[PDB]
Amino acid sequence: NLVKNKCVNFNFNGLKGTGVLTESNKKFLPFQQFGRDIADTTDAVRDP
Amino acid sequence: LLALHRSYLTPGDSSSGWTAGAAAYYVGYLQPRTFLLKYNENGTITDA
């Protein structure tokens, strides 16, 4: 389910994607679902 | 909807109302427009 340094697909109500997961400096507001980097690339996810 | 302390409810009401402290309320309309937002390095809204 939750893995690091090994890139996997992620599926959360859709949102299927490839990625390596890393500890992050992001500070979500509590009502937000996720975040994006420049040019609209999925940067981070919070697990529901 | 409005209400007041120690206020009586009847089928008919007078125009005097009920005695209370001062206040205000604003009403404005929302129509389709377009905005540019700036987000700082910490990720919060600063200028619209």
């Binding site: 009502f31 937000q32 996720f34 981070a44 | 404005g28 619209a48």
Partner: peptide, 17 residues
């Protein structure tokens, strides 16, 4: 009783940090 409305009512449209 008319006042110009300043920068009020701005909201997050997509709630994405």
């Amino acid at each position: 009783a008319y006042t110009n409305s300043f920068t009020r009512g701005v909201y997050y449209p997509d709630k994405v940090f």
